[PDB]
């Protein structure tokens, strides 16, 4: 049972949800910025 | 010399516009990267 307390999770599941939502928003905004500069040419 | 002056002015104007655009773009990238933190 101690060896199955080892795994790798320690935060409350609310904190896991907060981390997952924040990281989802991060990947969204970074992909949106990179797509903006994919589409935008400052020159003609 | 007048004609060469206006020609130099035109090329400087095009370069200035392109520089201001790339400068503002780099500033926006820096703002986004600092806001993500």
């Amino acid at each position: 049972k101690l060896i199955s307390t080892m795994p790798g999770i320690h935060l409350s599941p609310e904190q896991q949800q907060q981390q997952l939502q924040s990281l989802r928003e991060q990947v969204r905004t970074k992909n949106e910025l990179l797509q903006k500069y994919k589409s935008l040419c400052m020159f003609e | 010399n007048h004609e060469a002056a206006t020609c130099l002015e035109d090329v400087v104007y095009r370069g200035d516009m392109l520089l201001e655009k790339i400068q503002s773009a780099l500033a926006d990238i820096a703002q986004s990267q600092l806001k993500t933190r």
Binding site: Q35, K38 | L18
Partner: peptide
Amino acid sequence: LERVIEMIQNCLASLPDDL
């Protein structure tokens, strides 16, 4: 000016290849 333009272009040519 030309060099800067093509420089910007190839970096833009790099970025959808990351996307």
